[PDB]
Amino acid sequence: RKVIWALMVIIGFTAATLQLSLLVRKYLQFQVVELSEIKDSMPVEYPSVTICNIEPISLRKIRKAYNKNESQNLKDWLNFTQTFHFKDMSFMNSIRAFYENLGSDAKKISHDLRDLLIHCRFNREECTTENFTSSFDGNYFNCFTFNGGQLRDQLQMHATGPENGLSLIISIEKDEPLPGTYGVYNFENNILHSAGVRVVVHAPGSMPSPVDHGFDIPPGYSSSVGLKALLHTRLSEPYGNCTEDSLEGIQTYRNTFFACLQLCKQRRLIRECKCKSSALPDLSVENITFCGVIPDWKDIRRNVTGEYKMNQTIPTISLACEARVQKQLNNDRSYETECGCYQPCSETSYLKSVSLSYWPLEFYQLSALERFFSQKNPTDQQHFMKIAQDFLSRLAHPSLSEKEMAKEASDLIRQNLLRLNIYLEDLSVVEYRQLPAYGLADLFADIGGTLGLWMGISVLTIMELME
Amino acid sequence: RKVIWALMVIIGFTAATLQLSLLVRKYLQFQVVELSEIKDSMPVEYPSVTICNIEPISLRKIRKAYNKNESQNLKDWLNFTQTFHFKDMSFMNSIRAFYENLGSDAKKISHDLRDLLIHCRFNREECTTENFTSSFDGNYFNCFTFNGGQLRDQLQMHATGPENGLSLIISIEKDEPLPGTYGVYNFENNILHSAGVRVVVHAPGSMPSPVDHGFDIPPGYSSSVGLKALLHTRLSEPYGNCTEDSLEGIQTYRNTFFACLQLCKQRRLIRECKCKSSALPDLSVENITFCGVIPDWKDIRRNVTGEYKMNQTIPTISLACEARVQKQLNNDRSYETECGCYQPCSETSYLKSVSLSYWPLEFYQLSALERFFSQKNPTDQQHFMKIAQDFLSRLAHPSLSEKEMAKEASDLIRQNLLRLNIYLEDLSVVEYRQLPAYGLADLFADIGGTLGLWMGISVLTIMELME
Amino acid sequence: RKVIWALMVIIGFTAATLQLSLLVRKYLQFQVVELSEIKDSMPVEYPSVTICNIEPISLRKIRKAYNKNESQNLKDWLNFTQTFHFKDMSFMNSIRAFYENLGSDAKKISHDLRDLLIHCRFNREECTTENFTSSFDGNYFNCFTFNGGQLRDQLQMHATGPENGLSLIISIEKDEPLPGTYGVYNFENNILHSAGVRVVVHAPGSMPSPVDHGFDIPPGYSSSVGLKALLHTRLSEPYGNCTEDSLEGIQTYRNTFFACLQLCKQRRLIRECKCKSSALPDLSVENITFCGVIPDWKDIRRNVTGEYKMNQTIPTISLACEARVQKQLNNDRSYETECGCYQPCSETSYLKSVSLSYWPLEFYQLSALERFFSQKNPTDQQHFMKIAQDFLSRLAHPSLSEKEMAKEASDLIRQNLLRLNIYLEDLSVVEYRQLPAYGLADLFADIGGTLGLWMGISVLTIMELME
Numbered sequence A, B, C: 001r002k003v004i005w006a007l008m009v010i011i012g013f014t015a016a017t018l019q020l021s022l023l024v025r026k027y028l029q030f031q032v033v034e035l036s037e038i039k040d041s042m043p044v045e046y047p048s049v050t051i052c053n054i055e056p057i058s059l060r061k062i063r064k065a066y067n068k069n070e071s072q073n074l075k076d077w078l079n080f081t082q083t084f085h086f087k088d089m090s091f092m093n094s095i096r097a098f099y100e101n102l103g104s105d106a107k108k109i110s111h112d113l114r115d116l117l118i119h120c121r122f123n124r125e126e127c128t129t130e131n132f133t134s135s136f137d138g139n140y141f142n143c144f145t146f147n148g149g150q151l152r153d154q155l156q157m158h159a160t161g162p163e164n165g166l167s168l169i170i171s172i173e174k175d176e177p178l179p180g181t182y183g184v185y186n187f188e189n190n191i192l193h194s195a196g197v198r199v200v201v202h203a204p205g206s207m208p209s210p211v212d213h214g215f216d217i218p219p220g221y222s223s224s225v226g227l228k229a230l231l232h233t234r235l236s237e238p239y240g241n242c243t244e245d246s247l248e249g250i251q252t253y254r255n256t257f258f259a260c261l262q263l264c265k266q267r268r269l270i271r272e273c274k275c276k277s278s279a280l281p282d283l284s285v286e287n288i289t290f291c292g293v294i295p296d297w298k299d300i301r302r303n304v305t306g307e308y309k310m311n312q313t314i315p316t317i318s319l320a321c322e323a324r325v326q327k328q329l330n331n332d333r334s335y336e337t338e339c340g341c342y343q344p345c346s347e348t349s350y351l352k353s354v355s356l357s358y359w360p361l362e363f364y365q366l367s368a369l370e371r372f373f374s375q376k377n378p379t380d381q382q383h384f385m386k387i388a389q390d391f392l393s394r395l396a397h398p399s400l401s402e403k404e405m406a407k408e409a410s411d412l413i414r415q416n417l418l419r420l421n422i423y424l425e426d427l428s429v430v431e432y433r434q435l436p437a438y439g440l441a442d443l444f445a446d447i448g449g450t451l452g453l454w455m456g457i458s459v460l461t462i463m464e465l466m467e
């Protein structure tokens, strides 16, 4: 009978409706599929290169500013920090206390880029210190960025190999200790008391993080870093919550998730107890100063009125605040969900291979050293490698007794100098692209087959049943 | 005519049946698609860190136990191995002979963790030797695991950078050779005669493999290892033969394919000729001893009855067995298909970046050394760095003639000490997840469109043809 | 009415036609999906290993050939290059001038593999220099390839770890400078004046590129390179323009994109101004010689007729040509689109982890050195480490005054020797396979559902309308 026909048509209608609902719910689950493809002829951008000296403070600079009539704030601060008693003494002896309590005089204790960088060369063109930008850092105090995206437009690489990349001859400015003085190994820090250079190779125009993402370079070796470029392309809403925005910080930075988290930490500190930390990115918010500045410490020194008995305890509630919040943030990981930090939509990263070779050869030491002493200030009064130049000159101009002098000169030069080549190994860029797993066109195609037929069946059945 | 209608309907029926068969056969090919996604707010687990000393045997320990009245088994074994002749002498001089033929006395020749580890620190909290677990190893003899998942639950990381990770100051216990003795370079081993530390960073609770997966760390440098966590999630049956089981071995281990293969090798040796090898994982199966134990070698020494002429050949069939099977397994790769070893369903791995810096600076050497000699046994009678402390103390308390002493002290200290920081570079975890390429829901959706309509057509045709 | 029926059928026909067009256009967009799978039981091929000495020229060889009556071309060339004036003097002092202008005598200045390689061992079997193939290189002058795929078939690895891989003890042949001579640091090169070994680990039978893809190895350290194999499988047309061809060059090479680009550069130079460059792959095209050969420079030396006033300028238009085209190619990246260089269909790559340990230990130095001096020519007249052997022998046969000799011997030996182990960390191969995103079977299945039904509807409508 035709009732069987009607029931048997309506069951097919139900099946078609199930198909429609299933496909629509699949399209509303905005799945993504990633595919990796090698892009050639894509212009490669040379990364930003941040170099920091592992020894944050030059002791010889302190010694000769100690003899200077000028730089009185340094004498005041040192005598002040040794005359009293402070809770959290590990911070008072740190370099962050120097930075926070001596705003401008602290540049007289650090390393200047002219002292460090004795040779630069990019793409077979000579550098100077004129296209490095300096930033303050915690526990390194200064980090100099090449290709930071501020002085100049972004550099590009059109060749491979060490010749065409960046090449630096750096002197770590190691200093000879005085005969009777010795240092104290801070057994509560995992980074201090080394020599070398901390190098960060990061995406062009992004924020550096020398402590986390850097790698060390030892003196006396030519170290080469070969880079391979990678590009990650992500999808925005509704396929994901990635963003094209850029970080603000102290200067506009290209967006990276880690730097967003660091800025979130800084904002949380500022919100909670009205000061910012030196061990975190600077923000420059009004009415806010560093967590650890002791206001009027110069007045705290000088009892014009009867006050401040020696070995006193100076109350620093801001240090306790900042330390407590640091510990809470370091041991609890819940703030991350409360302050945004979406992933960047497009992100360039690098795969690096670092390798060492012995450098420089003895036969070429003297001439190299002749450059090093003929570039800087004509005041060669005293440097760690003056003895090296004297020994090498006395060898060249007029063999055991001179074997010791050659050995000592090489030992000094290789204790102080290093070379660093950063270059692109290949110009092919491996790109990981997100795609909509089930796009709108695919759904349109899958549905258009059943649309007309089944809503036609529905129209016919509805118009027949109405009578 | 209507015969054309019937034929033209049945051809569409055949086409629909082809579509059904094609989609069903595609769904029965259980294909998988992998996608990589960055998981944030996922708790990162600090890896297991296994450290081994590259010099397996301390010669000074042998020398002073040689002078001891106690430790007579050592004299017996040494005099025994030099008085006779053995086939495969490369094993008799090895450390595996020491381990196998002196079950407990062999702990008196190796390096103790208290001698090696002079400073540990995790997450800014002090360690001791109390949370390292010792395991025997071939060709290193001892490997100490931190975060092995047995003493404590798995550790977790909530911060990045060297400060918050594991930091170790290690002394490789280098020993000064005697004036008249020299060693013999075993030109038939590619690993011996080095100094440093072999480090393995492996998934938490998995089985270490120092020879294969380790990396060396040289003395006199602070070496930092920055880690990035990766997670691989695989699918079980019917999409693949991955498993959630765990390896048994000597102790329950988290499953890894390489360790399963090593256990398979050990089981094959045990099955074939009833002994196990030291160069492979221990199994502890009853009635089974090491391939290379010479039973009653103490009795073989002592001819109570007239026997054992000097320069005799002691028959060791077990060594020949184990060597022959080792060579067959190393040159033939067919056993792998016969002993299971499915891949683990979930597996965490790490990308590591290792870098060196010069350490420690001279200005901070003395104080550091003051710790090293003030931690261990009050018996400072003789150590490789006693001269270093003497020279540095004579420099500090009361400048060429002292320049040589400073140079020598630094040379010793940097020949013996090293520092190792292992930390997480980022807390984001890149996860590679398998997905069913063509799931059940997708098949249901693709088929439901044609199901009702075409089996309705089939029912109508069948009921019409029956008359 | 039935006109509504006809219109309502034809709209469904239009929808079905849209579905057909959409699916066909999707199938004509030959998309690909990549999936990564771990292949076990797949035979792993040991890579090709190219080693080059970083010091390209041994000065002692020049000195003693300078005293030889033979090798007169060297005296002629040296006296010629110092008597005149040349534009682009950085090339005349280079090693490429030596190579190009002294075709066969230049082998008397480089390093011979017998001088460098003092021990090889593969898969526990001894090597010789007999299965290394030598190739000329720019700025290294010689690169010796192991497992290059020419002398023998491709080697395979059936085991993991340092024991079963390749192990080399190499001497970098460092030479002691004369008391009164010193070198000139070429501050216009980023690679010169180092010591060590440049190692390239590349796909079996491919073309090496030591300057771009190599990594340095320092003397005095045992450096271990652990490799993990990766295989990339790409799709040919119509899914992509990958190829299965092989590069020609000077010898048949397995295809790699970078080597194709280098050969393209060489062909472009040859086309543009009829000479080839030494800093690029050799091609051996007829009527073509190196860009930088000065024809009849021996005749240019000797004015039989009154000519060639001293400090003359010798016109070398070929050098200017080759330099100008090099600069254009290095700063412009448009040639890449004009000379093919499709990606290879199948390509094996490696992930490498390099690590150092101190080597050799002092206790084992003498015996090691006893091998080194007892392998080479019985003429031990003068070598950089003769003093080391003398000191060690005088220590062993008959303790401060001997502490200096031990220290000096160790300093020499560790300045000259190094060890290199290259091995496979795991035998699992991670393969990235391309797949057709929407294959022919998938399209056939998606279309067969609608084919019969809707072209049946079309046939019925067409045959009804014709009357």
Ligand SMILES: *[C@@H]1O[C@H](CO)[C@@H](O[C@@H]2O[C@H](CO)[C@@H](O)[C@H](O)[C@H]2NC(C)=O)[C@H](O)[C@H]1NC(C)=O
Pocket (backbone or CB within 6 Å): A079, A080, A082, A083
């Ligand atoms: C820090 O500075 C103060 C200010 O000069 C020093 O005080 C003087 O110390 C010297 C010698 O110790 C005395 O002769 C002066 O009379 C002191 N001046 C005053 C105003 O009392 C002080 O010694 C410095 N050092 C320390 C550790 O406090």
Ligand SMILES: *[C@@H]1O[C@H](CO)[C@@H](O[C@@H]2O[C@H](CO)[C@@H](O)[C@H](O)[C@H]2NC(C)=O)[C@H](O)[C@H]1NC(C)=O
Pocket (backbone or CB within 6 Å): A122, A127, A128, A130, A131, A152
């Ligand atoms: C290094 O810094 C110098 C100093 O500015 C840069 O030299 C300038 O380059 C621009 C671009 O060609 C010129 O317009 C200026 O005239 C240059 N300044 C001077 C004083 O000559 C140089 O470009 C920087 N190097 C790199 C690689 O960015």
Ligand SMILES: *[C@@H]1O[C@H](CO)[C@@H](O[C@@H]2O[C@H](CO)[C@@H](O)[C@H](O)[C@H]2NC(C)=O)[C@H](O)[C@H]1NC(C)=O
Pocket (backbone or CB within 6 Å): A303, A304, A305, A306, A307, A308, A309, A310
């Ligand atoms: C600054 O502080 C010191 C420490 O209190 C003062 O030294 C004491 O000063 C009082 C009052 O002048 C004397 O009675 C004590 O005998 C001093 N202590 C000594 C000498 O050990 C110092 O005078 C203060 N500076 C001033 C008041 O200008």
Ligand SMILES: *[C@@H]1O[C@H](CO)[C@@H](O[C@@H]2O[C@H](CO)[C@@H](O)[C@H](O)[C@H]2NC(C)=O)[C@H](O)[C@H]1NC(C)=O
Pocket (backbone or CB within 6 Å): A240, A241, A337, A339, A340, A341, A342, B039, B040, B041
């Ligand atoms: C951006 O989107 C991702 C996922 O699309 C969010 O990640 C989730 O974060 C919560 C917070 O703990 C977790 O419980 C979920 O498991 C995460 N999902 C996944 C798939 O990992 C992320 O939170 C979003 N960003 C913000 C700022 O909310």
Ligand SMILES: *[C@@H]1O[C@H](CO)[C@@H](O[C@@H]2O[C@H](CO)[C@@H](O)[C@H](O)[C@H]2NC(C)=O)[C@H](O)[C@H]1NC(C)=O
Pocket (backbone or CB within 6 Å): B079, B082, B083
């Ligand atoms: C190994 O030990 C045996 C047992 O003591 C040594 O044999 C003694 O050797 C000394 C000197 O060579 C003789 O004076 C004794 O008479 C020996 N004892 C016996 C019981 O014969 C043997 O010398 C040791 N060394 C070697 C290489 O065999």
Ligand SMILES: *[C@@H]1O[C@H](CO)[C@@H](O[C@@H]2O[C@H](CO)[C@@H](O)[C@H](O)[C@H]2NC(C)=O)[C@H](O)[C@H]1NC(C)=O
Pocket (backbone or CB within 6 Å): B122, B127, B128, B129, B130, B131, B132, B152
């Ligand atoms: C290092 O080993 C020590 C020794 O057990 C561990 O100290 C114990 O830690 C647990 C967990 O907090 C406490 O319940 C015990 O009371 C501790 N023992 C002692 C003697 O105090 C320590 O946790 C280990 N370090 C790490 C990082 O695991």
Ligand SMILES: *[C@@H]1O[C@H](CO)[C@@H](O[C@@H]2O[C@H](CO)[C@@H](O)[C@H](O)[C@H]2NC(C)=O)[C@H](O)[C@H]1NC(C)=O
Pocket (backbone or CB within 6 Å): B303, B304, B305, B306, B307, B308, B309, B310
């Ligand atoms: C253990 O073995 C050695 C080697 O055979 C024995 O030395 C010989 O002993 C026999 C019998 O006592 C003598 O005839 C030989 O002259 C000995 N060889 C010499 C002295 O070179 C040794 O005596 C044995 N130990 C015993 C039997 O207690």
Ligand SMILES: *[C@@H]1O[C@H](CO)[C@@H](O[C@@H]2O[C@H](CO)[C@@H](O)[C@H](O)[C@H]2NC(C)=O)[C@H](O)[C@H]1NC(C)=O
Pocket (backbone or CB within 6 Å): B240, B241, B337, B338, B339, B340, B341, B342, C039, C040, C041
């Ligand atoms: C687990 O499954 C994999 C594939 O799903 C098996 O791998 C096959 O192993 C055989 C043995 O030589 C090879 O001939 C095949 O080519 C392999 N297949 C693939 C796709 O690589 C593996 O053997 C299985 N495990 C066990 C223990 O049988």
Ligand SMILES: *[C@@H]1O[C@H](CO)[C@@H](O[C@@H]2O[C@H](CO)[C@@H](O)[C@H](O)[C@H]2NC(C)=O)[C@H](O)[C@H]1NC(C)=O
Pocket (backbone or CB within 6 Å): C079, C080, C082, C083
């Ligand atoms: C290069 O070789 C020529 C050829 O011998 C040298 O010319 C000779 O130089 C010596 C000393 O300078 C004179 O005594 C000879 O008379 C020269 N020979 C001729 C034929 O003139 C030349 O000195 C060498 N060196 C240089 C820098 O030109």
Ligand SMILES: *[C@@H]1O[C@H](CO)[C@@H](O[C@@H]2O[C@H](CO)[C@@H](O)[C@H](O)[C@H]2NC(C)=O)[C@H](O)[C@H]1NC(C)=O
Pocket (backbone or CB within 6 Å): C122, C127, C128, C130, C131, C152, C155
């Ligand atoms: C190193 O080179 C030698 C020299 O040819 C190779 O030895 C040959 O190996 C083949 C294959 O087994 C034999 O057929 C030849 O008879 C061997 N030659 C000699 C002179 O014995 C050796 O195989 C090479 N090593 C490696 C790992 O390829």
Ligand SMILES: *[C@@H]1O[C@H](CO)[C@@H](O[C@@H]2O[C@H](CO)[C@@H](O)[C@H](O)[C@H]2NC(C)=O)[C@H](O)[C@H]1NC(C)=O
Pocket (backbone or CB within 6 Å): C302, C303, C304, C305, C306, C307, C308, C309, C310
């Ligand atoms: C090769 O060239 C040199 C440089 O011109 C010649 O030296 C000059 O030769 C001419 C002609 O013989 C003399 O008049 C000059 O006085 C020479 N210059 C001096 C001595 O400084 C050299 O003679 C040429 N060789 C020949 C012609 O055989």
Ligand SMILES: *[C@@H]1O[C@H](CO)[C@@H](O[C@@H]2O[C@H](CO)[C@@H](O)[C@H](O)[C@H]2NC(C)=O)[C@H](O)[C@H]1NC(C)=O
Pocket (backbone or CB within 6 Å): A039, A040, A041, C240, C241, C337, C340, C341, C342
């Ligand atoms: C091989 O195919 C790829 C894409 O399938 C081609 O890559 C294109 O190259 C041109 C040349 O600049 C670019 O403008 C396009 O953007 C590239 N496409 C993609 C998707 O990246 C490549 O050119 C082809 N090979 C040759 C030799 O033509």
Ligand SMILES: *[C@@H]1O[C@H](CO)[C@@H](O)[C@H](O)[C@H]1NC(C)=O
Pocket (backbone or CB within 6 Å): A286, A287
């Ligand atoms: C804080 O900022 C406001 C706005 O600029 C300013 O008026 C005020 O003076 C600041 N606070 C102090 C203590 O000066």
Ligand SMILES: *[C@@H]1O[C@H](CO)[C@@H](O)[C@H](O)[C@H]1NC(C)=O
Pocket (backbone or CB within 6 Å): A085, A311
């Ligand atoms: C300063 O006081 C602390 C405790 O308050 C004490 O340990 C220290 O010895 C004192 N310093 C001097 C120089 O007395």
Ligand SMILES: *[C@@H]1O[C@H](CO)[C@@H](O)[C@H](O)[C@H]1NC(C)=O
Pocket (backbone or CB within 6 Å): B286, B287
């Ligand atoms: C082997 O094991 C069995 C079972 O434990 C035991 O009875 C037997 O004694 C063992 N073999 C020997 C030789 O002792």
Ligand SMILES: *[C@@H]1O[C@H](CO)[C@@H](O)[C@H](O)[C@H]1NC(C)=O
Pocket (backbone or CB within 6 Å): B085, B311
């Ligand atoms: C021991 O015997 C071997 C051969 O059996 C011989 O080479 C060696 O020289 C002998 N040792 C002594 C000390 O005679």
